[PDB]
Design a protein around this nucleic acid. Structure first.
Ligand SMILES: [Zn+2]
Lengths: 93, 59
RNA sequence: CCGUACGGCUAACCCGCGGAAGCGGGGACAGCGGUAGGUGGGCAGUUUGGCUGGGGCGGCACACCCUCGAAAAGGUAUCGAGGGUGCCCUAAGGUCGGCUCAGGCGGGUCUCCGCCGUAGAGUGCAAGGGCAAAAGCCGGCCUGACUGGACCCGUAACAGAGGCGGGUCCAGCCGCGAAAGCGUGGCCUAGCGAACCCCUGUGCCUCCCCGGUGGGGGCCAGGGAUGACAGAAAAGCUACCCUGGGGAUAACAGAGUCGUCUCGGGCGAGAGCCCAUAUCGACCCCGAGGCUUGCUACCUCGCUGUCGGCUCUUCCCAUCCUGGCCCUGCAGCAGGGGCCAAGGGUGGGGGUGUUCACCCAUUAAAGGGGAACGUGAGCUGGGUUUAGACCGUCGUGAGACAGGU
RNA sequence: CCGGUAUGUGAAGCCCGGGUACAACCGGGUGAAGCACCGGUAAACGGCGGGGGUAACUAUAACCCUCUUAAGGUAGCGAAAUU
RNA sequence: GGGUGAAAGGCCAAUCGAGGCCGGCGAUAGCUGGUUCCCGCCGAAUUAUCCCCCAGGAUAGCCCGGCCGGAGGUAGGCAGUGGGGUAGAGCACUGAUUGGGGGUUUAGGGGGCGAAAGCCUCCGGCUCCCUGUCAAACUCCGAACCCACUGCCGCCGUAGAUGGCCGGAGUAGGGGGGCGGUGUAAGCCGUCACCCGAGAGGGGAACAACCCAGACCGGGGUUAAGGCCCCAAAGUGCCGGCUAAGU
RNA sequence: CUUGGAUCACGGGGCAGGGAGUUCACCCGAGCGGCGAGGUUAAGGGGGUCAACCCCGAAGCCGCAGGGAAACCGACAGGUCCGCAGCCCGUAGGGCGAGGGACGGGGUGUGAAAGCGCCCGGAGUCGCUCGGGUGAGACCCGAAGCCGGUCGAUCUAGCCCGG
RNA sequence: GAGUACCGUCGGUCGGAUAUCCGGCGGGAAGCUGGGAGGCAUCGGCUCCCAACCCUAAAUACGUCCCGAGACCGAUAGCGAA
RNA sequence: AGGGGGAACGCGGGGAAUUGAAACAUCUUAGUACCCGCAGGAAAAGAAAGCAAAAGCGAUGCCGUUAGUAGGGGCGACCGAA
């Protein structure tokens, strides 16, 4: 499925239709200096069992699309509706 | 589960001990702070059967 | 300057001998302490779903859409009938303009002209519904598949709701169009998902007397998944088995029913040297009984749970012999088929736990059934369903077999 | 199960760089045992095949063609305590 | 969770697939059992959604007790404004279904005069005219009946309507009878809201739900269902006709 | 108990005595009572005829202002209408009308803003009793089993010593 | 007033959360021009205090006992035992 | 000099499971039952390297409140100070 590389949309900071580049969101991994991860680390310690659930191999056949739209006049990004599932996705002219 | 004979032998009960009170003594040579170079001389006097040696002993 | 791999030494430490003192051998390895990764049913704690004309194996009726069922408002179930979705599309999405389909007839040869044509075509994908100067095909310009927020309908009738879905609008920024007008994804009805946690975006609030830096917490929006789909992180044996309970639920006899079963009937095709009925009677149609087997699940889960045999008494007739009769394709001797008749009789043995079935020799003939599949406060105890053990198959294994001993 | 380990991966610690007026934190290097890899072992667990065609009346196939395995059940015994 | 075992899970003081004794311990259970005086007023439900839920719970519906507020409400009917696709009927669409006739010949396999894929047909097909049959998932038509609303009758209501607030429950196995789907049937699954459950009394010989009929106490009288030869209260009743089989 | 009991479903030989919704802590409501924009004391102290009685003690808790995650900001002791009771004029009806219902205006969060949500025009608190919910053994009885510490080999299993 | 304050790591425990207390292991100070605390770490300012040695009454908890009392039971009750 | 005894109260160590979460493993039960040691008529603590915040207090211990609060937690059931 084909989506453009640039689209003309409302920018709520400039408050008008500007041109926007389309970017996908790249997923990073958990941080260690967070509070939940700290909790987890101190609950794993010592003599225990395993204190949380561990679902191994749980996924959907297709996932949604994170998509950020970044203006050119100011360079700020924003979201444009909800997501939609498709298996293939390729950006074009 | 239950145990093995392997595992009960390691505790030292009459079912597993050796009856050494039935045997003739231990067999060692001589302590060598006594045998510097003196080359002791001795005489055999008896030959006997030991129930813990699979070999005869001699006095 | 920091480690190393290797050779060597003895003075720590381990071994031995010995009152001891020391002597010998090994040696910075080992052992001891602390930490890090692996292996690990040797030992533990637990899990191993539910619906289910019993249960298990099978399937999913365990999340959604359409037609029927469904009883001309609404609503309405079953392991009820018939089918589909767990996607695809920058166009198949918005608008503006122009034009009309499948099929056939008549020409021309193996896409060309004309005509009839209410849609018999097509619509991104099922079914149903909708649609013709179109909601279909041909094109031109765009990205309302947007932002901030209200209210209402459905799932879920009447009559409670989290999450999801749809609809009518206010404001902003925009597209198409001469204009009016339309446009908050796909003509309508399917294509998906809580809490906590994490990632991204944006711009603001906060961290223990004060003020700075680094790093942390919060509000708002989007996304990563739980298909048992209003969401546990998870395999099996028990015939050594225990408890608590159940006729809400099977095997066993009873009740109900009779497809199957046994015993019959109507009609007359045709066969019988010719002759429909001596005898046989098709194909089709109509029944009795409750002595087979099934279906259901109304009684009984500690009443008794049982098969066969022996002993003992009684009943039905749909009669095997014994008495009496009628038809014959009945010369006699006999046979075949039918009516009355239930007083009496219907036995002995071989292999098998057998019932039945098969076989022998006799006999007037050696009938079939019921009585809680009559009869264990009457016997026996061969079979079957405990605990022991063997074989064959299946299983990694514990183990199982409506398989044998 | 055993042996070998040239090579890959592989935890903590140590080393280098970045960041932090110090730390947390990020990245890389070194990198044992184990796994991966190469080999030996069945009086170790266990396993040891199909479809077709053919000889002087009929039968049968000593024989051949194929599909195929890590290897295709040998000697014996056989309706067996196994049919 | 240890011993011993020529191994049967065999023995360990009448106790062993993990002893006996006190303690944790008045362990837990959605499972079984029980729960103590009288009269009076009202009076149910076993069904929709969710739960590793199906012998159990929650949210609602159905009962009770109090109070607020303050004038309409509608379990019945008549007329009207609207909606609907059932029974029945029929072929105008979808699809099935007998046969005879025309007319054109062919999508195609049988042949001949096939002097050679044709001028001639086959037996099929295609268009019409008659004839004879169908529909739970068809409809050119189309009831009885059902629903919503408006107005009038009729009933309730100021001795307090529709309605609202606060509190206390029980119910999550239903069954007879009528209607529908499935099934050889028995039965299974639903629906209707009349009855049993939670309902005495009179009759059906006796009978949970079939007929009459809804019940404070003492007495009197007339009826219902049905009955009137004896049992057994009341007719060996009246007229007309049939049965000879104790039907 | 059950849809369903004279049941071939369970409990049921006779008499007498015993024998099952209790107590605490929090929460929701009511029937009464006291004070009232305020209400109420605890521990404790003093006095007495000394476990009864009397006086002091408001620390604290609830309430009088709400919104918002937070920083922070910070409201009507009545402007209009309809109108029950009751009162006035009367003779049916009409007027004022507390409490009750509906509008309007305001505070704050969210948002450019409009509009939406909560809130504002003075009634609460303190006690006795009762009904209920939650937790504690929680109306009464009933398990198989899980854990801890001690006792046992005069039975029976095995081994040693002496007969 | 030194294997002490402190720093990292492991185990336990706490309401103690990047911010409780105890212990093991490996490192480790200054010491009066000195040193510690102020709820993540660090810099500065301000405020409060001087650890790593010892003793100490009163107000408190109990009741195998005593005095004294009681909307307690009254011989199958009340303690198991009148 | 010690050694042994003593209901409950006391100081110091070791340390479960049933049960609840309608299963269960982190949690809960619980620093509980029970075990080991040491003291008394009371024991233990106790004289700031503290509390706090622009103001200040002045050793310990007990009651009433603070408060089911701050805060911990499959952020669940629940636990819980100064
Ligand atoms: Zn911009």
């Amino acid at each position: 499925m084909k989506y453009p590389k640039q689209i003309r949309t409302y920018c709520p900071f400039c408050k008008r239709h500007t041109i926007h580049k389309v970017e996908k969101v790249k997923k990073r991994p958990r941080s260690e200096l967070s509070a939940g991860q700290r909790r987890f680390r101190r609950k794993l310690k010592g003599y225990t069992g395993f204190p949380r659930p561990n679902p191994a191999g749980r996924e959907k056949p297709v996932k949604k699309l994170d998509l950020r739209f970044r203006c050119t006049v100011c360079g700020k990004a924003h979201t444009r509706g909800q997501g939609f599932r498709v298996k293939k996705f390729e950006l074009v002219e | 589960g239950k145990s093995l004979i392997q595992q009960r032998r390691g505790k030292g009960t009459t079912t597993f001990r050796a009856p050494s009170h039935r045997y003739r003594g231990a067999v060692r040579y001589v302590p060598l702070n006594l045998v510097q170079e003196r080359t002791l001389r001795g005489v055999v006097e008896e030959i006997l059967h030991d129930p813990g040696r699979t070999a005869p002993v001699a006095r």
